[PDB]
Amino acid sequence: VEYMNFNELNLSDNILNAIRNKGFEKPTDIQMKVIPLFLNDEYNIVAQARTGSGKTASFAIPLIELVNENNGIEAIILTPTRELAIQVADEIESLKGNKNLKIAKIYGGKAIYPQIKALKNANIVVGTPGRILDHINRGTLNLKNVKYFILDEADEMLNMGFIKDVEKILNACNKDKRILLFSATMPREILNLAKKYMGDYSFIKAKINANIEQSYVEVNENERFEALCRLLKNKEFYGLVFCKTKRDTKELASMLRDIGFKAGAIHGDLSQSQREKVIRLFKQKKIRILIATDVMSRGIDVNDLNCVINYHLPQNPESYMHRIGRTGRAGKKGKAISIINRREYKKLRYIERAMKLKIKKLK
Amino acid sequence: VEYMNFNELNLSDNILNAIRNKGFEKPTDIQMKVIPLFLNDEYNIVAQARTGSGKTASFAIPLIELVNENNGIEAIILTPTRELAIQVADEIESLKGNKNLKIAKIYGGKAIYPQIKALKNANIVVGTPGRILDHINRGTLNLKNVKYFILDEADEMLNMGFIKDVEKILNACNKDKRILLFSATMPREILNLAKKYMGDYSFIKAKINANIEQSYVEVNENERFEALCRLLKNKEFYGLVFCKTKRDTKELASMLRDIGFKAGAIHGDLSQSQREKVIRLFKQKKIRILIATDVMSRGIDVNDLNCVINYHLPQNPESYMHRIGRTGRAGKKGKAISIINRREYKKLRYIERAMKLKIKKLK
Numbered sequence: 001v002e003y004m005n006f007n008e009l010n011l012s013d014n015i016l017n018a019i020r021n022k023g024f025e026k027p028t029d030i031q032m033k034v035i036p037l038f039l040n041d042e043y044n045i046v047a048q049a050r051t052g053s054g055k056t057a058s059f060a061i062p063l064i065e066l067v068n069e070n071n072g073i074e075a076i077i078l079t080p081t082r083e084l085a086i087q088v089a090d091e092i093e094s095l096k097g098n099k100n101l102k103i104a105k106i107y108g109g110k111a112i113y114p115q116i117k118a119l120k121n122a123n124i125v126v127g128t129p130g131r132i133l134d135h136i137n138r139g140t141l142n143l144k145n146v147k148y149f150i151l152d153e154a155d156e157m158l159n160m161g162f163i164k165d166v167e168k169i170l171n172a173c174n175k176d177k178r179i180l181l182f183s184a185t186m187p188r189e190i191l192n193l194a195k196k197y198m199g200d201y202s203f204i205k206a207k208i209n210a211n212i213e214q215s216y217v218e219v220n221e222n223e224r225f226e227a228l229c230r231l232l233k234n235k236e237f238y239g240l241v242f243c244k245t246k247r248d249t250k251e252l253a254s255m256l257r258d259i260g261f262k263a264g265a266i267h268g269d270l271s272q273s274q275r276e277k278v279i280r281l282f283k284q285k286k287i288r289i290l291i292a293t294d295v296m297s298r299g300i301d302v303n304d305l306n307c308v309i310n311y312h313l314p315q316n317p318e319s320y321m322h323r324i325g326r327t328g329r330a331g332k333k334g335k336a337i338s339i340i341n342r343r344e345y346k347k348l349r350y351i352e353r354a355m356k357l358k359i360k361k362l363k
Numbered sequence: 364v365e366y367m368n369f370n371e372l373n374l375s376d377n378i379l380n381a382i383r384n385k386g387f388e389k390p391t392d393i394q395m396k397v398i399p400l401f402l403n404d405e406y407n408i409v410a411q412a413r414t415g416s417g418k419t420a421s422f423a424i425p426l427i428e429l430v431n432e433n434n435g436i437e438a439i440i441l442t443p444t445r446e447l448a449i450q451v452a453d454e455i456e457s458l459k460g461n462k463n464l465k466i467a468k469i470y471g472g473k474a475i476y477p478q479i480k481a482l483k484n485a486n487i488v489v490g491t492p493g494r495i496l497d498h499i500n501r502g503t504l505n506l507k508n509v510k511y512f513i514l515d516e517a518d519e520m521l522n523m524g525f526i527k528d529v530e531k532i533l534n535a536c537n538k539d540k541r542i543l544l545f546s547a548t549m550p551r552e553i554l555n556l557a558k559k560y561m562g563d564y565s566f567i568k569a570k571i572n573a574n575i576e577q578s579y580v581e582v583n584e585n586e587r588f589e590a591l592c593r594l595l596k597n598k599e600f601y602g603l604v605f606c607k608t609k610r611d612t613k614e615l616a617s618m619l620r621d622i623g624f625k626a627g628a629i630h631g632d633l634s635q636s637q638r639e640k641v642i643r644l645f646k647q648k649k650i651r652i653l654i655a656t657d658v659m660s661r662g663i664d665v666n667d668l669n670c671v672i673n674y675h676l677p678q679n680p681e682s683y684m685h686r687i688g689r690t691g692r693a694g695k696k697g698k699a700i701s702i703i704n705r706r707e708y709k710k711l712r713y714i715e716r717a718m719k720l721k722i723k724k725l726k
Contacts, residue, residue: 001405043565186558188551188555191555191558192554195554199566199568200567200568201565202565203409203557203564203566205562
């Protein structure tokens with residue numbers, strides 16, 4: 001049982017178009033281990049996947065596939081944050097295609113009334129545990145038709161006190177639901193969670209470090225740009241280079257163009273439209289090298305890259321996971337080289353230690 | 364997918380004979396949820412099953428099926444005790460048939476030298492964790508060819524300190540092994556065990572609560588026999604009624620032969636030369652009701668029953684599990700009714716706490 005293409009799945013046509021569309025060409029280890037089982041709809045699933053491996057597709061694809069656009073609320077998707085709630089919601093939007101599924105996003109800060117109207121014809125709810133609870137208390141929500149449950153980043157939820165709430169939300173649900181729990185780490189409580197509420201589940205662990213060989217170059221702050229050049233070497237290179245600031249993206253892109261490369265920048269303050277035409281020139285390969293800040297690194301992408309280069313290595317392990325998470329391909333190898341100086345070592349170590357990763361060396 | 368007959372499995376002919384032979388006619392919930400997956404040989408398996416549900420067949424069947432009789436040691440089966448090691452060994456003997464698999468039993472008390480000769484051409488080792496480890500740590504036993512690992516009653520092992528030893532035995536093994544862990548209960552450590560050493564496993568729980576439906580009748584000590592009659596009702600009843608003493612079995616059987624029923628009393632005072640005549644007739648149906656004491660309830664049986672009635676609630680709560688563990692049929696319901704009086708309600712609640720059971724009521 002080793003698939004390697006979305007078409008090879010029991011996926012509809014309407015969706016198998018939008019996935020090839022949005023950029024999802026080849027699957028990731030997880031998407032190929034989950035989508036089948038989720039679609040197969042045999043058992044519950046406890047998946048261990050680092051953020052930045054296609055998780056959101058894993059469940060959002062089969063979800064759009066199995067959730068009826070005619071019933072009421074067929075699914076709930078819990079998340080630690082609102083930021084992630086919206087991310088999840090949107091990625092589902094960009095995949096439904098000619099399937100009219102209404103997705104209600106629930107979370108604090110908003111007025112309750114609008115939310116009730118929003119759930120009215122909602123098909124899939126995606127919000128934080130704290131509100132989705134109260135909200136179901138108020139009879140405002142109807143767990144009556146909920147056929148699919150999904151706890152996205154349960155270990156994050158757990159370290160935010162949400163555990164009790166999640167349990168409550170699970171209880172106040174049919175026992176004819178299908179649960180899928182995603183967690184980068186498996187603490188005692190998550191394991192116990194699986195035992196208490198999900199019976200007869202299939203445990204799946206994905207290796208991201210085995211999918212994307214990571215390396216790094218130690219250099220002096222002055223020969224940093226000189227490192228990015230040696231790495232860019234052939235004018236055949238086609239990839240993504242990550243910065244730190246909007247200034248670095250403009251500066252680095254212009255210089256690179258003047259030395260013969262087809263570079264271009266992308267960053268925050270840039271208009272929605274522009275962010276789009278640059279990704280277009282990029283996807284099309286008019287621009288073989290896109291210099292960018294984390295900004296774009298979280299809310300776009302419309303294709304896969306041979307490799308990813310961190311011109312600047314983030315202090316944050318999660319942003320690292322989001323960056324190199326553009327290479328992970330199904331059946332073929334990924335590549336991420338990070339440029340660091342003598343003082344950015346304690347950090348590298350922490351990314352490795354925190355994401356249980358192994359990044360070797362280059363020179 | 365789900366099956367309801369051994370033949371429906373990828374089982375050989377040589378074995379599918381000895382299983383029909385030894386008595387294994389219909390499968391048990393566990394056997395039907397494991398043998399397929401074990402045979403399918405896809406993932407590792409963490410199975411939760413009370414002792415007395417067919418566990419030993421679950422792994423021993425597929426084991427005899429997949430282990431080559433020509434290689435060396437292809438499998439290790441750890442157990443808490445020697446009593447259980449031997450039980451396990453024997454049940455494998457009685458199923459191999461025309462397949463020459465040598466099974467070495469390893470454990471304390473015995474001299475090491477004979478054990479070494481025993482492993483020489485051994486195919487499957489079955490012993491306690493303390494000794495198998497000493498052999499491993501001393502070069503005596505070689506894990507080189509071990510393809511299948513089986514921890515039988517890991518929760519029992521855990522509460523005997525064996526945990527450390529089991530872990531050591533797991534380490535000093537190829538990482539190309541197949542692990543199957545059986546445990547009646549899932550403490551933190553077993554769950555953590557699964558996480559640490561078995562990656563990507565399928566969790567299976569054989570919930571009897573929904574497989575065998577247990578009920579009970581509260582009555583006055585005087586209308587107890589009157590309860591057993593209302594329960595025996597139709598002369599179509601074919602089952603097993605459990606007593607307390609040899610006197611009760613003789614008396615109760617005669618009271619029934621006084622109202623037409625053909626019934627037989629089996630006890631301990633009974634020599635196997637009699638315990639045969641008896642059961643013989645009960646399966647042959649030359650008697651449609653067998654009244655018996657725990658005595659037989661542990662070392663015989665040569666067929667399945669529609670239902671089991673506890674005329675008296677046993678003392679030892681595990682005997683209860685051994686009794687109703689004769690109605691559980693492969694995907695085909697079963698039932699256990701227990702007769703109790705006002706004061707006997709104490710023993711009942713004791714049995715239900717010790718077993719995490721739920722026995723409802725009949726009136």
